[PDB]
């Protein structure tokens with residue numbers, strides 16, 4: 001899972 | 012032991 | 022950006038008050054809190070001028086490094102006025118008596134309470150808190166030059182904050198040294214809590230929630 | 241007493257250079273671990289003697305002198321290495337005849353990681369142009385900051401901090417530049433401290449593997465972790 005990058009790249 | 016001795020006996 | 026405006030930038034980045042909305046249950050409540058706070062920590066970092074101008078590898082690495090020290094720095098500021106209290110959340114206040122209920126915690130609660138007391142004694146200001154929390158993120162192990170410039174501007178902001186207290190030149194330097202020497206104490210606590218959490222995950226005794234699991238695994 | 245006098249005291253207090261010969265053979269797991277632990281053990285002895293020569297150190301509780309030294313020893317070893325290694329880029333000057341390239345790290349599982357941090361931190365010290373009198377004050381601050389004896393420790397830590405501030409001001413840079421320099425030096429404390437933790441875990445692991453030797457003092461100081 002990649003939720004750090006998901007949240008880093010969106011709002 | 013050795014730390015305490017070096018701190019106090021030396 | 023004037024150091025004043027950087028600090029307002031940081032003021033404006035502050036994450037909201039988080040609530041856990043109600044032994045095993047203490048630990049379950051700390052992990053569940055850690056997961057919610059990590060969500061808000063990500064938005065917080067994104068709002069530090071220039072953080073989003075760093076490489077995504079840099080952004081990922083600085084948050085993976087620093088997250089527990091940033092959770093703990095926040096805990097100490099929320100705990101600063103409440104000696105004997107670790108103010109995890111409004112619906113989660115713990116003393117070291119509760120700390121006792123789970124092997125390895127009391128040691129951690131003690132380090133956090135000691136360090137907190139050190140900041141209470143120094144009367145840590147809010148604006149000092151904001152600068153040092155950011156410093157913890159930026160100072161954790163081209164984009165290399167952008168990060169040096171970002172860390173150097175938050176360092177600059179903390180020296181200004183201190184300049185504004187009005188104390189003597191000598192006393193500012195001594196105040197700056199005393200706040201910064203406390204960072205290796207936060208990093209000490211951080212290392213201990215992460216060790217305890219890795220051990221807790223390894224045994225599968227608490228739910229190591231999604232964003233939290235990813236963040237622990239990085240270490 | 242005065243900051244200058246504290247610095248002059250610390251200067252005199254510097255331990256002597258410990259001499260270790262490189263193994264005749266190219267390095268093995270065993271010969272590299274044997275060389276670095278022999279050196280650590282001999283340096284720990286001189287450390288305790290150096291600590292006793294810090295004004296007010298011996299006025300502390302015996303049990304605080306033990307806790308500070310158990311807490312900071314690896315960090316203090318590592319700051320000494322980085323200062324020995326600062327006039328010799330790429331190299332780690334563990335001893336006059338025990339100079340190691342990041343390369344020879346190869347010879348022990350995981351010690352290449354450690355050598356990198358050590359070279360990276362050393363680099364930042366070289367970029368900051370860390371001075372001798374600064375190094376003296378910073379090494380002292382690492383021992384005193386590694387946390388009525390508690391009232392006396394606080395006062396001793398502020399005296400070395402006062403000394404560093406005095407050294408930096410002797411440079412004549414603006415006040416704002418003194419603050420920045422003091423900040424940049426100190427923010428490295430956490431980096432040294434990181435290198436110490438990884439280094440201690442590593443040593444604890446190598447001891448588990450049967451690789452470590454029998455050294456009373458070093459084993460003693462590692463068991464307080």
Ligand SMILES: N#C[C@@H](Cc1ccc(O)cc1)c1ccc(O)cc1Cl
Pocket residue numbers: 051052054055058092093095096109129130214215217218219221
């Ligand atoms: N103490 C503690 C927490 C981490 C933490 C620190 C600051 C916060 O604001 C929120 C949480 C902990 C310690 C051991 C452990 O196994 C798990 C957890 Cl979550």
Ligand SMILES: N#C[C@@H](Cc1ccc(O)cc1)c1ccc(O)cc1Cl
Pocket residue numbers: 276277279280283317318320321334351354355439440442443444446
């Ligand atoms: N690097 C290194 C050494 C420690 C050291 C550092 C500075 C000195 O002046 C002397 C020794 C080490 C690293 C890992 C390990 O498992 C064992 C050892 Cl001895």
